[PDB]
Amino acid sequence: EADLTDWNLPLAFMKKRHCEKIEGSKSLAQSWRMKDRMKTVSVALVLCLNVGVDPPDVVKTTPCARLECWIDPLSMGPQKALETIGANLQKQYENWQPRARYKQSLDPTVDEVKKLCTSLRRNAKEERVLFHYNGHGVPRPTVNGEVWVFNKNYTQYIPLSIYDLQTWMGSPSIFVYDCSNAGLIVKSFKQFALQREQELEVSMKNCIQLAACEATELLPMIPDLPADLFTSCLTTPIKIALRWFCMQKCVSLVPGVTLDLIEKIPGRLNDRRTPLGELNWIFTAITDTIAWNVLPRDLFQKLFRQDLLVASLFRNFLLAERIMRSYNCTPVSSPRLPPTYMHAMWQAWDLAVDICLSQLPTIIEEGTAFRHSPFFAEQLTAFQVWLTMGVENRNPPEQLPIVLQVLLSQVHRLRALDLLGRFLDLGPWAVSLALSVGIFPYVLKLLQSSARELRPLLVFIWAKILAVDSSCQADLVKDNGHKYFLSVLADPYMPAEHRTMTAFILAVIVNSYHTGQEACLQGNLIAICLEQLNDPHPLLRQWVAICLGRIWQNFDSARWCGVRDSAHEKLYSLLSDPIPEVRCAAVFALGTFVGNSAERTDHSTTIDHNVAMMLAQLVSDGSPMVRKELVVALSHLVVQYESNFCTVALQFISVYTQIWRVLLHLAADPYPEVSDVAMKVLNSIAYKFISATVQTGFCDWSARYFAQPVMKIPEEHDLESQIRKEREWRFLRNSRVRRQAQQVIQKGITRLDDQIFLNRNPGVPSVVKFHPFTPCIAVADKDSICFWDWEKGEKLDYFHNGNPRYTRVTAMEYLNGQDCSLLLTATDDGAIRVWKNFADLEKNPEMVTAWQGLSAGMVVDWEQETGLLMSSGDVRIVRIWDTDREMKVQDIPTGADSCVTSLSCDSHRSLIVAGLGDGSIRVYDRRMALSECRVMTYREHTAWVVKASLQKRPDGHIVSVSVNGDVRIFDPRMPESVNVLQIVKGLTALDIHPQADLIACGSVNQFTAIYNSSGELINNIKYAISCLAFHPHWPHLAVGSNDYYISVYSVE
């Protein structure tokens, strides 16, 4: 079948740089940064336990609850018990905040608390101060807003107003209440804050309160639990959690587990390898997950991420709420947290505790080895499952804080980093979510690790983070992570993808950041980039060039280092790189290198001139983006040498003159954007300030690549995707069209006199080109390009090609005819421009690319199979433009004075033919050397060769016709004509059909002869015919007379 031919055809000018507009992605407002870092410098422990005496308000039961801070006061005397309880509570709080000035107050008086609070506030005027109160030994707070303490003789409880309590304290502070009606204390505190606010007109959000109970509710009195329950939850969450779990009915599932075994649990809270440390780690992760999933982002950042002590207190407050809900006790906090007792993660916590403590009897008795919990592994498996179909922006995964926690240890660090990188690959929203969770400091700390297996994952994560947010450069430079990135980039054994990832990271780090530029310069990054400049990888070279450009941006020391290393000479090689992106990056780097001369010695001037001349040979470039980067480079040149350019400009109203000529050439550029930039630059020189400098968005556009997902399969490879289905339908339609055309041709050719439609055009139809498959013909005028249809018979579009008056559209072609067709329109002056969306309903005309070629009119011959494009005209030169590399590949001399009137080629062979104005039809074979490219040259005409077209068949027969109208069919293997025919004395235009040997000619007397290769008369249509065109498949012919009428003919 013919389907394979369509599939294996490169699509010229169909890439990211052509489709997407070259601009930088707007940076989002990254609010993941922490606004301030508070610290609990001091902690106040006020313990009104009243050991040995029961408050009158509550009549305790005979067994009651005698456990305070895991201590039984009655067994060791009143004063000793009180002191040891204070010390134990201080130890418990130190477990979370070891560095803080703890000042215990044991049954104090109002004056004692006053002095303590005032001294602590004076010590820490702008830092958090924790105030812990235990009202177990004193009567309940009253509605008036007072807290009861003891007098000197301990004979009566004297009140302490909350108003004065917070007067002694400061705005930055957190209060922890362990009383019966602590909700009353919280309410009174809020009322006093409102009173202060009212009085101020003629400290509510800053203060944080944690209360054991609501105002009405009472603390539990069950003997099993400790009397001091809320503080036990806040400060020793694991012990109380295990005790509570052992008190539930779930123990029935696990016989042989008792509180006695819990008391003898091995391990400590720090070593995560031990059972108790693992349980603490799991509890921390579960509480963090619950807080992140339930609380809003702002409140979560304020509470669980501001400082260690408050975050731990609230993480344990979640457990306190869950535990005390079962006893008709509702803890209260100043910022009302939505309830978390029903969260699904508590079930996972229960399961993890069950699995951990199911092995405890074996550990205690048999002394077996403790197997690590599969909790983290299972959670990471769940995260991977979510990522499997997490492409859509659905609800964020609940395991992000779990990934954060598992990153801390090394048991699952590699898998955690891999999953995190996969998540960040999803897009900028994923990285924003990750940074909000708070991975940034820990990922930054990871760079200190010397483990060689972490380099790829870490560089992937950091490249993503820097792509979404560029403010991390300061943090990276502060932590000396750029040394880690340099070490990564200095390893040839590392895969190229990670090396270019690190190159992008370094480029972002030194992007307009003097500190980072200096740090990298002291890191010999210039040498590292130079050694890895010629690597066989387009993206790596592009980003190394971009990094080199950004290193010496307004940095004289970097420029000197590059000069010592001969950076410019080595970078010159990239100017010929086939990939346009690398060429643009090299041009940008050279321009930045030039822009910071800063009036150095004559050597600097010589090097600047050398770079200017090396860039001045880049004008004849196919890529408009590279030409724009070049224009920016010459603008930097002008800024460096403003006075010289001003003198040169005033001279005409020899180095700088050449650059002025280059800028003038770039000013009359086919691409509107490049022309506008060049004209702005020149006008900036005419009126001779800093505002004239303009920076293109190429660097940011390239940086946008790392923001997009890379791991996932491209949409093109997707077999069931809509785009591939549409392409398959288009190819099926093309195959059907070819089959129908072949069937029609096999039936012979009959007289074609049918006039499908007759219309009128605003201008003279110059060149008419048929779209091979879709029913559209592009008719080009002097100042417009019309697109008509021969089925609907309606004008579709009317362009303004953009060329000046003196110019004219001579040649036209249909790039990518099989699908996603473009229109190449080449004017007589050399300007070649490509159009897209030229016959669409919902899309306006678009310009893909354009580039001044060369520099009879001008002739163009597109070759889809090999992707080459050949241009010729009045010049004695046949240029060979390659759309893949967007550079002129070969330059075969014409070797004749006359202009090239026509141009054609034979598919699958190098048989470039060219009709000449004098009459000679020359054949060129590009396989051999340029001097021997000429193959044959036969001269049997003395007139302009209207069309020396070639037949695509293997036995190519060059049908050359001149103004004299004599047809002479030639062959590449015979220096003499095979068939000589004479048709019209005066000929104006003609076209030839490769599939059907039908030669359509014109006449001055309105005649239109459509004859055969044998010269047999077929038709003589009676109406200057200046444009004929044959549909490449159908036997369709379009005739446009001197009058602006367009007609298409067909055989029945």
Binding site: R272, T284, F304, R305, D307, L308, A311, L404, Q405, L407, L408, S409, Q410, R413, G438, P441, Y442, K445, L446, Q448, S449, S450, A451
Partner: peptide, 9 residues
């Protein structure tokens, strides 16, 4: 930092 990252070199 809120948490304690260990085993970092």
């Amino acid at each position: 930092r809120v948490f304690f990252m260990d085993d970092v070199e």
